[PDB]
Design a protein around this nucleic acid. Structure first.
Lengths: 85, 92, 63, 130, 142
RNA sequence: AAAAGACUUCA
RNA sequence: UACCUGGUUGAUCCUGCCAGUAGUCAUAUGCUUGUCUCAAAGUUAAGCCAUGCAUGUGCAAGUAUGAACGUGAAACUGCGAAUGGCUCAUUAAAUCAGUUAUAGUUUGUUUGAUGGACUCGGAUAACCGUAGUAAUUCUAGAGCUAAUACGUGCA
RNA sequence: UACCAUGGUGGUGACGGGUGCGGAGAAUUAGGGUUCGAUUCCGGAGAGGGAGCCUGAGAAACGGCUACCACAUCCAAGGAAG
RNA sequence: CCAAUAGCGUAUAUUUAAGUUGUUGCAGUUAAAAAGCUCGUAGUUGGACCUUGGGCCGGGUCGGCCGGUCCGCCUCACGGCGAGCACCGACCUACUCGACCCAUUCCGGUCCUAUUGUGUUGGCCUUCGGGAUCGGAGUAAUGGGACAGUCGGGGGCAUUCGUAU
RNA sequence: GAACGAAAGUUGGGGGCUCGAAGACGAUCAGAUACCGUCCUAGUCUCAACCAUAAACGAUGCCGACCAGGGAUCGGCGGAUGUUGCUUAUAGGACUCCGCCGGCACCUUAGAGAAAUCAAAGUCGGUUCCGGGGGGAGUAUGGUCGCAAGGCUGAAACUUAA
RNA sequence: GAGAAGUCCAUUGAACCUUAUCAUUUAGAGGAAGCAGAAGUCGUAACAAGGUUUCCGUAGGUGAACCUGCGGAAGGA
RNA sequence: GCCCCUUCGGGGGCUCCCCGAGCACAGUCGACUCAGAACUGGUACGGACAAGGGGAAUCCGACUGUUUAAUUAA
């Protein structure tokens, strides 16, 4: 079982021609900085697993923490998004 | 650049051996010929050097006289313009 | 290949097949988008029909 | 950006002007500020003329005082909305000493500081009407 | 002011700048130097004074244990110092006088003033008047 | 519409 | 409370900095300390080290017991010596913090759970008797002897 | 560790360099920040430098070993020894 | 004479002052300072009006060790120490509300699911919801650029004139 | 990131008059390599190609909102109004003549600015760059661009009570 | 049945020497004159329209302060 | 042809090649060579043989080149 989620967008996944099942997810977060009180954003990108397939770049998904199948692939593509019908 | 600091074009042809005032000029004056050029007739990036002052377009094949190093230059341009102006005043 | 990013006979293949999977997965997300447009059309085209449907009763109720 | 400052400046400039009233274009948030102004009797009233179809709106805001002194002794922006400089229910740093009010688009809506304080809400200060 | 305080990806840029501009002094201090340093010196010399007026103070050059040679001022009236000795230096700042980055404050072998009062812990002596100087001289010899 | 230069230090 | 005042000047106002002044440290110079009372106590060498010493238990953990007189006690086995202490050299790191994950995993001992008085033999230290590189440190040729430490039969 | 794929990361600072333990906290200053991060509490780390191992539930061990090197020591100076 | 007084200054370190790293809390016309100017992004921000969600917010309840800090009480003659009690803590984790601001319904065909009432168990059939394929009826889908006009010493090319030298 | 970017320099080639560094000289004068005079080459110029800087200034970044008027200047625009003046059914080019819109500048305000001044340099909002007491220093060193010149980038030791 | 000294292959995998280079502390081949003290010489530039108005980019070149050619500016007549 | 359902009477159910999209290998013909590992020897593993000794300071000429055919190559 999982695992908490982060939202992110699919930065890449296609280098190149075929890549093995997985995608890159850029995640953005911010926190309000003490002092100046302007928020700072700091990215992070995580390599999500794609056993399901069908995950293209520019795709918002949900990452959940999962067992590592290698190392720095810790997460899995819990779900995606879209519309009707 | 690629693996080039200062810059070069030719400069390996000197090597370390040779020297500086002359090197400021000679990259510039062989390489400006080397620059693919668009033919005055066709427009494709064909024009290359046959000999000193001789230039030829690979696609259409039109061969032209021009400067030693360069396809053209200020002097030729000025001479053509003056001639055209003179013919136009006479026609008047 | 002219960039010479890949050196050898196996080693070419995995990058091409990774890309077949990415671009294809792009292509199933794309068919999923393309189906989604046709479905939203379908839903719309039902609303527009039954906009015109709701219009025709208004005269009926009147007389 | 946001209008906000223009409305504020227009008002105080108007007061100095001893102008009967001022006018400009408006929203819900800049009607909202105006309403708070009316509620705490800063201005006599405000109207939004031509409000239905035309390309714009306007807002005839009437200034209060006329005579002697002007009601709005001082009004200044601090920091507009979208935002940060942000206050908490409790953090409320301020001017006057309760003589004046600070329009704060809270969470809840745009209300005055006292209401927000009660309201148990923080938000983003619009300005310090004195 | 530029931004003032917003969100979407933006505080960080003029955090960087402020450190970089920094006047004062970085990474505490030592390009010579600080702390209590005991330089054993054998140069007694006299040096001049700053652009405003003249004098000629008597000075003694000292070479530090922490490898530096500079000229140091001696305070108090009169003085003697001998074989080496070890005279301890405060390294206080004038805000400037030529080549004179430090002064050697009273410390061990650095003596104090002709038997006085007036005062005694600036410009300094011994028990009542003197008593300390007599003992002081003995130390280095044996 | 001008021949022509200097003028120790601290007060 | 915090707040300032001296120096650019003939004199002025503004920019601007130096300096005094205020508080404070895990610190030094120190002159000078009648006093009760508690407290810091090598960011220098993670340099190098002499001397004593920093871990012990059999009146129900264990069968046995030379020597000492049921009582104490030396070795073996069980529990312990890894806790603790101290220093920040390494050190910007899922190192650490805070939140979760952990059926993806350990927990002896204990607190707690679950299982459960026939006959027995085996050799061994202390004690001993001498010893080798031998002054040695050290341990063995070696007599003797005891095992809920071992090996078994097993509803 | 095989085989297959050639990658993954960085103009939101990756990789790299320097830095006269990290947190709980300390000192300031009206507030803000600045500063400081330590002896103590807490977690981590190392025991002259470095790797490996037995033992034991738990050690990769300051008060155990192995053993190269660094450095003192004992010597009836063979060898031990920290 | 006197400030302080069993302490004092001196230096080092550090901070305030010093709005002199300015978030609160400043300049860039002549004071350090406006980028020669543009084309454009990643990056700060956003004119009006209606509606939906809900990342930015209230209440929360967890943790936020002790020590220290603050209040006040006693205890060693006093005090500081120390004891005992109280009060405050950012922020971060659950939960729920909250929003100002940053096509569908119905009805039937076609496919699946169907404990049941049964000692017991096997096979079988129809109707309704969910799930799948559907067919029909009521009911959506909304500052830049453009055209006419004007100046000009806008740029490039050709023509052409003259004083003077 | 990228583009343009005076002049002067640089480089090939054409032209090369006036001009004109340097240089050649005369006077000055104590010295003149100086001003002042004569002479004089690259240059000035053209076409090709570099550089990336100027007191690139409006000493005023660039975006938008508001907040005083007054004389007319150019463009158009709404004209009003007739007349020159054309032409001549008539109309604008302008002209008597007001208004709007954009720029301009001066003249020129009251709250600001240190004052000088500004009417934008205002009243306070957006945004980038960038500043750091002076001198050392727009310099060292390394990297980057340039044929080179040099440019961009950019410190300290130290020194001074400014 | 247990299995001592022991010898070999493979692996984790010490320390001296082999690199080659970078860093720190240093000294230092030889060399340039940036600031400074007052007690120096040279000229008199800038400073008043500074006796040729200042400053400036740019090259040339001069004992030097500097000069001037070209173009630009008014912080200039 | 197989499952199948049944109250036993009798019934119900179900291609090859090449393409788009989700979640190593086998057979013919089989070679030079780059790396990697293990044991273990030898004194030495480029085992022979061939096959650069290296570093700094100074002078000259910028460099490649040419020259006393038969005592000068600078």
């Amino acid at each position: 079982g999982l695992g908490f989620k982060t939202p992110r967008e699919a930065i890449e996944g296609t280098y190149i021609d075929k890549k093995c099942p997985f995608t890159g997810t850029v995640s953005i977060r911010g926190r309000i900085i003490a002092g100046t009180c302007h928020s700072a954003k700091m990215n992070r990108t995580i390599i999500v697993r794609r056993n399901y397939l069908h995950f293209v770049k520019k795709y918002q998904r949900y990452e959940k923490r999962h067992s590592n199948i290698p190392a720095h692939v810790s997460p899995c593509f819990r779900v995606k998004e879209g519309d009707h019908v | 650049m690629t693996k080039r600091t200062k810059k070069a074009g030719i400069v390996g042809k000197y090597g370390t051996r040779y020297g500086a005032s002359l090197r400021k000029q000679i990259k510039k004056m062989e390489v400006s010929q080397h620059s693919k050029y668009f033919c005055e007739f066709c427009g494709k990036f064909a024009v290359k050097r046959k000999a000193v002052g001789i230039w030829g377009c690979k696609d259409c094949g039109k061969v032209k006289a021009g400067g030693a190093y360069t396809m053209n230059t200020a002097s030729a341009v000025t001479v053509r313009s003056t001639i055209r102006r003179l013919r136009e005043q006479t026609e008047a | 290949v002219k960039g010479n990013m890949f050196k050898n006979k196996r080693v070419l293949m995995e990058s091409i097949h990774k890309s077949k999977a990415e671009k294809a997965r792009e292509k199933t997300l794309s068919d999923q988008f393309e189906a989604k447009r046709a479905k939203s059309k379908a839903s719309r085209e039902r609303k527009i029909a039954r906009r015109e449907e709701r219009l025709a009763p208004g005269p009926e109720r009147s007389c | 950006m946001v209008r906000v400052s223009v409305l504020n400046d227009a008002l105080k400039t108007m007061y100095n002007a001893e102008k009967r009233g001022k006018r400009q274009v408006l929203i819900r948030p800049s009607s909202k500020v105006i309403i708070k102004f009316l509620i705490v009797m800063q201005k006599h009233g405000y109207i939004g003329e031509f409000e239905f179809v035309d390309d714009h709106r306007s807002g005839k805001i009437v200034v209060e005082l006329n005579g002697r002194l002007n009601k709005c002794g001082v009004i200044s922006p601090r920091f507009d909305v979208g935002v940060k400089e942000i206050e908490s229910w409790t953090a409320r740093l301020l001017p006057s000493r309760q003589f004046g009010y600070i329009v704060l688009t809270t969470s809840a809506g745009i209300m005055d500081h006292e209401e927000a304080r009660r309201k148990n809400v923080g938000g983003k200060v619009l300005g310090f009407f004195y | 002011m530029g931004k003032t305080r917003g969100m979407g990806a933006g505080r960080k840029l003029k955090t960087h700048r402020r450190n970089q501009r920094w006047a004062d002094k970085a990474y505490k201090k030592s390009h010579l130097g600080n702390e209590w340093k005991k330089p054993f010196a054998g140069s007694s010399h006299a040096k001049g004074i700053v652009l405003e007026k003249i004098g000629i103070e008597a000075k003694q050059p000292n070479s530090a244990i922490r490898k530096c040679a500079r000229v140091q001022l001696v305070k108090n009236g009169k003085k003697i110092a001998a074989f080496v000795p070890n005279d301890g230096c405060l390294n206080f700042i004038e805000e400037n006088d030529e080549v004179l980055i430090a002064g050697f404050g009273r410390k061990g072998h650095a003596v104090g003033d002709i038997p006085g009062v007036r005062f005694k812990v600036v410009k300094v002596s011994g028990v009542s008047l003197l008593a300390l100087f007599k003992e002081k001289k003995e130390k280095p010899r044996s």
